[PDB]
Structure formats: C-alpha cells, structure tokens
Amino acid sequence: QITLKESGPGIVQPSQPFRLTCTFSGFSLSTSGIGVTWIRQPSGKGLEWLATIWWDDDNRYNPSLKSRLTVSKDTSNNQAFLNMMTVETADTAIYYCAQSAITSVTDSAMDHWGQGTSVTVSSAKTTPPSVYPLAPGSAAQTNSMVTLGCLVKGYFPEPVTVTWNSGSLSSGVHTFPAVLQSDLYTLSSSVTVPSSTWPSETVTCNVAHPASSTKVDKKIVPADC
Amino acid sequence: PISPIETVPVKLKPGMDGPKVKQWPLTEEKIKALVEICTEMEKEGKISKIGPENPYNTPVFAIKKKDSTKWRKLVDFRELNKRTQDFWEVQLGIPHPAGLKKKKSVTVLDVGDAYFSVPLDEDFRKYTAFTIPSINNETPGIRYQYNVLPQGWKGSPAIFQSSMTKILEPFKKQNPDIVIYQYMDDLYVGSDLEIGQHRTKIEELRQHLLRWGLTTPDKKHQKEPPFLWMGYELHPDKWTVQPIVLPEKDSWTVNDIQKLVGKLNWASQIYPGIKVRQLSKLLRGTKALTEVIPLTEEAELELAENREILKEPVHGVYYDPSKDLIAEIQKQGQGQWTYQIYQEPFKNLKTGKYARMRGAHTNDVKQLTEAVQKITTESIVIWGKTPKFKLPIQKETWETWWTEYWQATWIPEWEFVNTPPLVKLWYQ
Amino acid sequence: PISPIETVPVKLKPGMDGPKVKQWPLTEEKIKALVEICTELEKEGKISKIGPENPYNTPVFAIKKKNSTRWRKLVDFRELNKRTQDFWEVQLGIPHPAGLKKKKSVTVLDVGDAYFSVPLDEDFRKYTAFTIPSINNETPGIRYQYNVLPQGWKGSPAIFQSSMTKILEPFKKQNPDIVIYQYMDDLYVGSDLEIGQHRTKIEELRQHLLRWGLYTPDQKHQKEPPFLWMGYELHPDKWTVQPIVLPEKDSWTVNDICKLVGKLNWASQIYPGIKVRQLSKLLRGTKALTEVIPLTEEAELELAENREILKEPVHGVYYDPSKDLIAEIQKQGQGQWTYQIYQEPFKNLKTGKYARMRGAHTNDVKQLTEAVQKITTESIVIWGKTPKFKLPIQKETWETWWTEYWQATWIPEWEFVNTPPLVKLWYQLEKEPIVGAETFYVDGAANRETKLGKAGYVTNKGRQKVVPLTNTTNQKTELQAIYLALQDSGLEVNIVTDSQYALGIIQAQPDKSESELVNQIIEQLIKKEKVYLAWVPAHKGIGGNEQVDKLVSAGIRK
Amino acid sequence: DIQMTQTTSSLSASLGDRVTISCSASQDISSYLNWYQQKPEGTVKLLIYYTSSLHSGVPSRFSGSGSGTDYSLTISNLEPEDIATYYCQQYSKFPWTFGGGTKLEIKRADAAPTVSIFPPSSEQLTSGGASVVCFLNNFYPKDINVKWKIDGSERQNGVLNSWTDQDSKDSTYSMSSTLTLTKDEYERHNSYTCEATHKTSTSPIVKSFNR
DNA sequence: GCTAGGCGCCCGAACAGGGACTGT
C-alpha cells in the first residue's frame, strides 16, 4: 500500500534550479524509523545516492553535491522535496525517491521505490524533427528480405514515437535510442520485410513528436535508378 | 530560594549516623565533567560549597551516557539510602503496578532534574555532602552539599511524589491504557501500542513534562550501522524463564550417572518430587568412571520422569514486598550468564539467562555490569525493587572497572562471592 | 598580619565538654620564659587574656631546643583533640612529581606562620584555654586562649587547607594557565610564561595572599633549580628523590627492621627493583619493639641486593600528556612483583612493587591480575588515565585462564613481553574422565570432640589405604584423602570427592598456598600428567563413595 | 568513502541456471549491505537487505551471503523476470554507495549482424546535409565494432552510434551507426564503406555504395 | 616534662558469613 510518485519539471535550463516532489501515502514521515531517500540514475549509468531526509530532520547529503542539494519535507501532506541549485548537463538523469526505513538494530534499506522523474538539462528549444526515408540506393533488391530505414534527425525534446504503416508492421522493427546532435536529438528506425512486399506494396514511416505537436509520415520510395 | 513549598523533615534510622564513605579515584575525563556540572549547580544554588566541619561524605563519579552522549553526575547514596529506609519504604512509598510487567513495550525516562525544584530539609542537608578529587592530588578535594532533593536518594521520589502524581493526572486520564511507574530517577512508561506509535506517545509524554518544567535527556538516534536506539524500549513479554534441564543420551558412563544424580540432588531442594534412589543403584560398587552402564527400564523411568517436573512452577513461590531481594549470577562461559532472583533459600521467583551482546566484545567485567543492570531493570519493572547481588567476581576487580560500563541512574547493592562450579544446576 | 577569612565553625563531639586538665607547677625559670613568649603572641593577636569564667584548661609546659637554647611554648592538646568533633579530612593523598608536566618557569613558595594566620571559630576559642602557673603559689597564673589555629590541634590541618583553597580559588579562576599544587602551607606554581611575565605573576600572587594575611617569606624558591619539593628535587627535565640514607647498624632490633623496611619502600617508588618480602618476614611475629632479631641469609641477600641497586644513582622524568603511559610488570621472588611506568623506552616516570598475597591459596595468574588492578588505580590517581600494559604472560595462557575460571576477570589493553620468568599455569585438569586409569574414591573424617581422624581411598581395582591423622579437621582430612590418591597412582588418575572445599581449592589451579598439605597436593598435580576430579554428594549413599565412607568414618557413624 | 564494486559487469545465462553476483566492498562493512533489482523497464525493487534477508514478497529462489568485504547474490534457478540488472548498496556509513550493477542476460546461439547501408536521402541533401546510415541488426553476443571508410581512406570523425538492449523475444542486440557530413563533404567523394567486425566471422562484414 | 592531618607497607587480631557436623 506504500506508493511514491516523483514530480518534476522534466526539462531544466542550465545554471537554473529544479524542485522534485515525492508525493507518498501509506506511511508517515513522522514515525520513528522512516525517512525518504533520493536516488539519481544518469541515462545509461547506475544508481547514485543523493540524500536522505529523516523524521527527526537529521538529514544526510552526498558529499559531492551537498553544496547544491537541499532536502525538505511537508510532513502534513506527506511530501518530500529535493532542490538542486545551478544544474549542469551532467545532472540530466532519472530521479527516484524511495521510502527508506530503519526496521531494527541492523535492518536499514529502501523498502519501496518510485518510478522516477526524468530531468534533462539543456538550453535547446522545442524543435520538431526532420524525417528522411532510407531505401537501398545504388543496390537493387535481390529476392529475399529487404531492410528499409527511417531517420529522425534534430529534435527536442524526447520522446518520439516511430511505427510503420500506421502500426501494421511490427515484426522486424528496430527503433534505436536517440543521441545528442548539438543539443538536439537524432535517432533512426529500421524495418525488415520480405522483398515480395516491397516495393509492390507501400511502406510508410510514422513519426510522432508530442512536444511540437507534429505528426509526419514518410513513404519509403525505392532508389532513383 | 527555589520553591516556596514547605520542606519535609527527614530523620535517619534511630541510633545510626550519616554516611562517612571515602571518595574513590576518578579519571580526569570524569573529574573534568564532574567539576563542570557541579559549578553550574552551585551557581543555580542547588548545591553549596562546604568544608571540613561536615564529618559526612559520599562518593561521586560521572558516567557518559551512550544514551544521550551528555554526562550525568552520580552520587553513590547507597549508604545514605539505608540510613533513612524508614522514611521512603514504610512511611510514604510509591505503589507498584502489577501491569507494567504486562506490556509489549516499556520506555524509561530520566526524570532527575525534576528534583532540583523542591527544597531539601535544611537540617538533613549535612548528610548529602560529597567531595571532588583532583588528578595527582593537586588540591584538597572540593566539597559540596544539597539544598534541594538530590538525585539518587531514595527519599527524593518519595517527597516529590505529591507533585509528580499531579503532573501525571492529565496524561494518565487521556491515556488510561498506558502504565507509568516511578523508581528513583526513573519513569518507566509502558504501552501495548505499536512500536512506532509507542515512540510517538513517549515523545508526547516528554512534551507534557516539558510543559511543566520537567526536562528529560535528549536521547540520540544514529543513522549509521548499529541502530542501538532500537533497544531503548524493553519488552517484558519477550522476557523468558530459563528452566533446569537434564541431558539426553543413550550411552551413560559411570561418570555421567554421578553428575546426573548430583544435579538431581541439588534440584531436590527446589522440587521435592525428585528421586534418585532408582538411578543411583546403577552405581553400586567401586566402578571405573569411564564405564558405559546400561540404563535400566524402571531406572530410565525416573530420568525421563524427573525431567517432567523440571519444567513446572516452583512450589507455591510468591513474592513478599516486605523481604529483600537477592540475585545470583554464574559465569556460564562463551559469553553466556545465568541468574536467579529469590527472597528465600531455594524458593526463587525468577530464573533467567542473560544472553550475550556484541557491544560487550569479550570483556568479562563489562558483561557482568551489563547483566547486573539488565537484571535490576527487570526487577524494578516486575516487583519494583532492586535485588542485592552476589557477584561472581573479586572485590578488587569489580571496584576497578564497574563504573566504566555503568549506565544507570541507580546503583544496586552487591557483595562478592568466590563459589566454584557448585554444579551445572543450570544446563545451558 | 592576621586573616579576614571567614572563620570555619567547629564543635565538640556530641555530649562532651571542654578539657579541664590540671596544670603542673613549672619552675620559675621555665615560667618567666613562657611569659615573654605569651606576651609576644598576645601582642601579635594570636592569643588573648580570658576571664575567670573560663573553666577550661589544657597543660602547657615550656621546652628548650637543644641547639638554639631558645625556649618554646608547647601546649599539649591531647584532651581537646579527644573531644573535638570529627572533620571530614580534605587532604585526599600526597602529590607525586611523576604527575607534573614540564613547565617553562617554575616557582615554589612557603607560607610563614601558616596556622597562626587563620582565625579560630570564636565560639570555640574558650576551649583552647591554657594557663601559665606563676612563680609562687600566691596568685593564679596568667590565663590565655587561642585566636588562631592552634599548633597541634585536630582541626588545624583540615581547617587551614580549606581556607587556603578558598584564597587561591579566585586567583585560579583568573589564571587558568598556571598550575598551583596546593599542599598544606607549601605552594608549587608553574607555567609556560616568560621568566619576566612569570615573576610578575608570582609577585601578583604573593600580594594576593598578603591581602588575606598569608605571608610568603623571601626564603622562597626563586629561579632555583633544583627545587626542594615534597621531598624530591626538581630539575629542568629530571627529578630525583632526596638522598635516602639506608640505616646500617651492628645489631638489629625489631624496631630497626621497621626503620629499614619503610625507607626501602619509600625508595622503591623510583628505584627499579627492590625486594622486601624477605627481611620483612623478620618482625614476622608477636615480638614487639626493641628486641634484637637474627638476620637470616634470606634477609641478608635481600639487604645486599637492595643496597646495590640503591647505590645506583637513578632519576625520573616528567609527564607528557600526548604520549600515553606504559606499565611493565616483572615477576620476581615469592609473591614479589616489580613494575616501571613509563612513556618512552627506559625513561621511567615512576617504579614500584606489590607483594600482597590475597587469599590463602592463590596462583601467579591471579596475582598478576592483582598487580594490574592496583597499578591502574595508582595511575588514575597520578594521571587520571588507565595505562597500557606489557605483561610477561602468554596470550594463550591468559585466554585459557579467564575462559575456564568461574570468577569474572579481565585486563585492559596489554602486550606480551617475553622476559623470564614468564607467568603461566603449572597444571591443567581433565574436562573428561580419562580412560585407562584407576578411578579412586577418596574421603576423610575426623572428630571435633577429639582431635584426630582417618583419611583414605578405595580404587576400582579393589585397592584400599587408610592413614590415620592427629590434630586435624574434616576439611583437612577430606583434603588429605586426595593427597593419597595422588601419591598412590601413576601419571593419569580419576580422583573423586564429596567436599567442595577441597574441589574448589583445586579447580582454582593454585600454584602457591599458606598451609603445607596443599603445597604438597599442588606439587603432585604439577608432577602428574592427567588428573581429573569429580564431585559426588556425600552421605547420599552413592557408588564408590560408601566404601571410603564406612572405612574412614571410624569416628563418625553410618 | 566506501567504494562498492561489482566486478562482473554484463553476465549471460539460461532459464533454469544458477547465477551468483559478487559485490566487493572497499572496507569491512559488517554485513550492512542490501541488494536491489532493476527490471529492463526501470522499476527498482528491494530483494535482499542485511546481506541475506528476503524482503517480503521476493521468491525463495533468492539468497544472499558474504561477510566483511566480500558479498554475493545467488539466484537459484533463473525465471524470465530474473534476467535483469542487479545492484548492491552499502549502508554502514554515509554516504550510501551502490555497486556498479550487473546486467543478467539470456544466453543464445551466436548470430552474425545483418548489415545494411543507406545513401543520404534526397530530402536531406536538399537542406544541405548528408547522413549515411548503417544498420547492424540482430546478432549475438553484444560485443561488436564498426569502422567507416570514405573513398578507401577511413574516417573516425563524424560517426554517431546507438546500441539496443537485448531483445526480449529473440535475445539479440542491434546497433545503428550514422556518418554525418556536409552536402559538399559528401558530394566531394564517391565510395562510402560501412565495415562491421563481429566475433562470428574473421572477415569483417562490409556493405558500401557509390555516387 | 613534645603535634596534627594525609598517603604508603607489613603484620596480626578481631569480625563476619557460609558450610558441615553432632545431638533431641
């Protein structure tokens, strides 16, 4: 019955501060053994401990970031806070908040966790992606299976939805995770389908970018010659 | 100069004078703390400087409570407490709640400061004198005495009871399911509430006291490794009774049978239903110890029968609040200690086993003092009185270190005994 | 002058009156001398004429110094003292130069006319009344009473020390960086101030004491290394005990033994190893006072060995706070132990020796434990800190002992220094009955009304022996029977008693005792190879115990 | 500052196997270590606390052990869910520290990378850019390298990459490499060679195009 | 017709308490 949900800004300007909210239920931040811990996890890396705020206000901070951290709490409404000052691109990560608790004389672990809020650090402005089809060029198709692609370049921010044929094709589909292209994001998706269906039957690439309210389709037309 | 409430007259036992006990050496760390806490009480006028004209004395030392880090002054008023045992015990004593033993959790608060607010009988003050020593006898000892109810004196809680019963009226009315007992500088508060909900209610009680002038030590709760503060509350139900048990075997040598009858003979004083004639028969002539004697059918009929009596309540053993309490400890090795509490020879009231502690870290002296405290605590809770101790150690040894591990507001009455392994009457 | 220090109140023991002791007629020669003295003390405010109303008197006779020829007023307060209340004496122990810290500038001061400078409780002076009989039996001698602390009175020391503590009290609150070792009327002052700012602080002190009436004569230790303090000599970095003159007489009376031993003990505080156990057993007895006693070779070797190590000029060093303490114990003669407390390799702070045998039947592990304890206390008193030990006992030896001993024991952090003779247990004891050995059944008995009794064993092998004894008791005979089964057996045995008295003395694994019977039983235990004792409840008719009972119980019955 | 390290970084195994994860401490932590499970999605759950105590709800096929400096997690018989990333956390001293994580995979028969390359779309070229995409789909195990070669000579400058997680269906991995140049930098050449080296074939799998 | 108070050591006497045995 213990639940925890992080609240955040998701996208934060560099050098500005951010404030995460851990809204919980099921326990009180006033009971003897409870405390609320904040964990970070850079995209790709492992778990990093930030700080733990306890019922008796005897808080403990990560020595590397104590200068930019401040953990608060609203015991009344069951909320825990985490402020970070002068954030850098290095603070782009998923932040989790979990209910830490001291059970006995040796038992002390983070019993329950949250799903985490993603906070990314960038000046980049919400700009839509430019979609480019990928069809075997200079190499005509044989008689087996052909692999068509789709390139989603220069967008911000995450995420983007990629499907094929309005969601019809889903078997040999591979959508790769994006990467940073000068503050912008760039990803590609590939689809493999028997040569007996392309280009005899149309294959279109579906790209959705919620931030910019843009939805564009691009048909994978075969090579010029 | 402190409280306009009328002073209550206290007179020592007829034909007995005041305490004239000498002051034992004190370590610099304790003198330093003791000199400080004494200076402050002098300013506030709880304590007055005195000289040679006062023929009485008592010992003092300080203990650095791992409870709250902060030091505490302790005055060994055991002598004085005997000299005035008419005043607090028979005259005006604090009733005992049979229900405190019956609580899943009980916390204990140090309500000593509460006493520094009632004027002590102007005449009786001479007896509370004490001396502070100095490293390398640099200066004559600095002496003081009390002007207000002193901590660690059996009379203080007795006198302060009037106002104490009034400070508790509200809390006890809004929480009739909580038991509260006062024993000297301690308040034993026990509840059947959940642990975390108990911690709260205690914390609330501290407030209610604070709203009345009574301050109670601020106990620390560390957030690292050994979460010792989880032990702060006692659990009277979790307390067990270690019974006497006869070994179990198939191949009983001559030796084994001897010891098995020895123990059974000892135990015959506790349980009159122990017979050994049928079992001793196996040993008749001058046989060699190392000789597996077959256990007879009607012979092993008592071995498995007597043990069926060694798990029962002793013979109509009841506690008498009018007789003292005695307690014995026997070093059972590998860090284990057993104990027995009784008022009469073999009719004991409790028999238990004080299992080890990792904070003791192989130190016989440290474990014995902890055992003494642990046992005293249980005593106060269950019956409401400290037992006299028959300590399995040498005087010289105990008096050199017991203070280094003492962590209680009170000091029990003890004597030293050199009784060798009488018998493993208490098979651990 | 005199002091403006509030007077300390003194009473007489509950239900007693003052001293009304008659005065002896003194000689016109002695009388006239006292008159000058008293007119002087009266002139200086120390004493005062009392009225005819004062019914108290204590004996006062004059006595001359066999060197200066000066006569001195000597008042004998033996009776007053027997009636003066009890004081809780404030002096708690003498100070030791070993606890002194190295200070830049050191000065020592002495108070002149100390006692005669502190006022006596006005409601008590009447008891210090004394009279100076006149030359002729004509008119009553001059009557006087005391106004200052009477020389040789019970409260004079306790009252002066407290007074003195109050005087320094404020001064020490304003100079927390200057140590004042207050002892009777002698003051040691030391600090890390510059010779100039120091002497400017010392004068500041002398003028503060003069304010309270305490005079500090110019016969004080000003920049005078070594300083003569407490019977020692304080040098910049080293201190020496003042020349101890070992008494070397022709014949030796019991009294001369007491005069030698005490001076030896006094020296043992700084002199490496000093044994006394031996020549101390000379007065051993009821023979008192002046009675020549024959100095055995036992004592001769003691005196010779000591005079040698006492002829070795040694010293001590001061205490350094940062560097902890180390106490090293050495095992010497029967019950004689020697220790050296230091903080740096062979830089002794203080030495000493303990030889108290606690218990009738003890052993070397016990006594070592006893030495460690009394050393700790002694250190706590001089340094307020528990020292680290370097004991000559194997880590394994100790583990065995405390782990098997039923009594609780312990020893603070200690290292093992391998310097013989090492301390260890001389004989073990089987936890389990050994297989392939006679399992003896020993017992004894005796008659209180008579004096003698038998004692013996009955083994499983049918063997029996009963040796009768005279002037013995149950405890001795039941202890005798265990001695037999020891002599009458191999290297492996299984004795079996019915008395804890005997069993207990044994399990304790003693290696020394008071009575011989036990010294013999110990000698056997150390000689054998596998002993095992077992206990059985006597008079309960059990196994091989009945055999020895009836057999030895020729005095008792059933 | 207690450094917690899990030497074993990425570990593959099969359903039913027995796996043990090692967590080494930088100093004695007196058995004050907890174990965490983080599913591929991301949710984090507490398995074991205090070296070897199961948190209510975690299956019995989970068990911890270790002491002093060395600690180990043992999953008796792998189940589909188990295959995940595992973390050890120490709390005998703040700051609290976590291991390095040990990804638990699914063992599969080896497979080579199906390599496809793509000429910069026309639309991309119309803007003024040019990206040459090169997919390396479905292979085993993960370890793989890529090298770009323009008109013979190789170019390591301008190459982006993207690796995928072990597919939860066929247990394979995939990678996407993209060489981005300019409209000029691109047209000013002819042969663009995508080369991929996997453990399956000694010969690097190569795919190229011209003009 | 010469101190007091304090600490130390060594010694033996008186005490005190726990056990064990003898007599109604």
Add this chain to the structure above:
DNA sequence: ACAGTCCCTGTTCGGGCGCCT
C-alpha cells in the same frame, strides 16, 4: 528439622615504621 558449634577464608582495622607540611 534444626539449634548450637566449629572450620575456614575474606575483610577490616589498629599499630609502627616510612614520607610530606
């Protein structure tokens, strides 16, 4: 079923010497 003694061992204390002020 002890009451009345006797043993034995551990502690306390009074005495004398040492040393100090």
